[PDB]
Design a protein around this ligand. Structure first.
Ligand code: XKW
Ligand code: NAG
Ligand code: NAG
Ligand code: NAG
Ligand code: NAG
Ligand code: NAG
Ligand code: NAG
Length: 339
């Protein structure tokens, strides 16, 4: 017997105390070690309602990631609120590790185990856990990287599909690798990401098939982002401490709905901070081969409005509200207070 409630969670992880990597350093002083013997209990004859779009755990993870980045990254110049802060900017070691979110005494986490659960409504296979699974705090736009996969079918998630201003999270059931590289040998900020077009276009085709099921079999068209800042019009992520911006036009090629797809990328030293606080400048990139191989596990999409009059629906790669990144992993959990 319990009741939905919000409370302050703590974090746990397997951070190494001897590592200089900044996530390990943060988690070493802001998280406790993981519990060696996890205690998950299936709750029999128990149905429970979930709502991933009103889940205070999302707000709490966002606060953690903001804190982590604020004490880890070291721009040479920070421009925020009309002021300018200049400081030392050594190169850092950067590579996310899994963070587990845990309830204090008197509370527990309920976990939805229905494999086609869309994030809202009743769940018939519910268990209780003390902590979530390990979630990597990967900050990206357009593509969700290094996350968990849907266990059966591709899942379309939205707080309201009819409202085109609401972001769509596409949860994939097969990961697709994206392999990004700034080579050793020219223009030191020039990079590229390689994706196996065979695997990708197959998944994309399956994604379009799912979208048809929710939009009454209209024609599904992909278009590049309309406009905005580069962090939004590009797939932006952080690889080894460097800020990558990749052009995803060839990833959403309507015609292919087989060879290697090569996306042009650039590392940028001057960025708009995803925390919303302003602009920051970092030092030039490190020497040598900079390489990140990530698994694409989801896609953020925004649907064009005003198209009811037509027979097609147009989708543009989306993102920017990084909270949706955490929502994509926390959708199956909720906190309750034991009574
Ligand atoms: N120029 C406009 C500005 N947009 C941003 O700040 C913004 C959005 C997303 C990112 C971002 C994403 C990913 C990465 C990384 F590389 F790490 F993956 C870096 N940045 N930045 C604002 N308009 C209004 C606002 C409210 O006050 S904020
Ligand atoms: C999710 O499931 C609920 C309950 O079955 C339904 O009301 C809602 O429309 C669904 N959302 C999507 C995006 O399928
Ligand atoms: C992923 O889901 C699609 C339908 O959404 C299904 O046809 C496909 O077989 C699934 N793939 C895997 C590997 O389960
Ligand atoms: C969903 O969005 C449509 C279009 O904006 C709106 O008319 C409707 O009221 C929304 N539904 C809910 C439950 O907010
Ligand atoms: C990633 O791409 C580079 C080429 O830049 C290649 O050397 C490397 O083997 C690739 N890695 C994987 C896992 O495909
Ligand atoms: C992406 O590439 C296409 C074609 O190369 C180009 O027309 C478009 O402007 C690029 N997008 C951005 C945001 O630079
Ligand atoms: C994704 O995970 C791999 C393996 O740990 C890592 O090398 C890569 O840097 C990660 N990608 C991002 C964007 O953090």
């Amino acid at each position: 017997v319990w009741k939905d409630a919000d409370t302050t969670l703590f974090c746990a992880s397997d951070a190494k105390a001897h590592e200089t990597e900044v996530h390990n350093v943060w988690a070493t002083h802001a998280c406790v070690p993981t519990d060696p013997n996890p205690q998950e209990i299936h709750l029999e004859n128990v149905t429970e309602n979930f709502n991933m779009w009103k889940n205070n755990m999302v707000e709490q993870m966002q606060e953690d990631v903001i804190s982590l980045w604020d004490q880890s990254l070291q721009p040479c110049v920070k421009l925020t609120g009309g002021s300018v802060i200049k400081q030392a900017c050594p190169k850092i070691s950067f590579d996310p590790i899994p963070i587990h979110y845990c309830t204090p005494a008197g509370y527990v986490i309920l976990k939805c185990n229905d494999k086609n659960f869309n994030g809202t409504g009743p769940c018939k296979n519910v268990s209780s856990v003390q902590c979530t699974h390990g979630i990597k705090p990967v900050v990206s736009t357009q593509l969700l990287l290094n996350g968990s996969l849907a266990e059966e079918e591709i899942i379309i998630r939205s707080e309201n599909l009819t409202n085109n201003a609401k972001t769509i999270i596409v949860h994939l059931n097969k990961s697709v690798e994206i392999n990004c590289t700034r080579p050793s040998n020219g223009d030191i900020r020039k990079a590229y990401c390689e994706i196996n077009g065979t695997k990708w276009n197959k998944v994309l085709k399956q994604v379009t098939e799912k979208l048809k099921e929710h939009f009454n079999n209209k024609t599904i068209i992909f278009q590049p982002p309309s406009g905005g800042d580069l962090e939004i019009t590009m797939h932006s992520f952080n690889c080894r401490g460097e800020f990558f911006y990749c052009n995803t036009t060839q990833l959403f090629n309507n015609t292919c709905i087989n060879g290697t797809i090569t996306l042009p990328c650039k590392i940028k030293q001057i960025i708009n901070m995803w925390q919303g606080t302003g602009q920051a400048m970092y030092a030039p990139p490190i020497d040598g081969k900079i390489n990140c191989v990530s698994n694409i596990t989801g896609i953020l999409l925004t649907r064009d409005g005003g198209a009811n009059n037509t027979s097609n629906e147009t989708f543009r790669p989306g993102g920017g509200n990084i909270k949706d990144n955490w929502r994509s992993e926390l959708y199956k959990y909720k906190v309750v207070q034991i009574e």
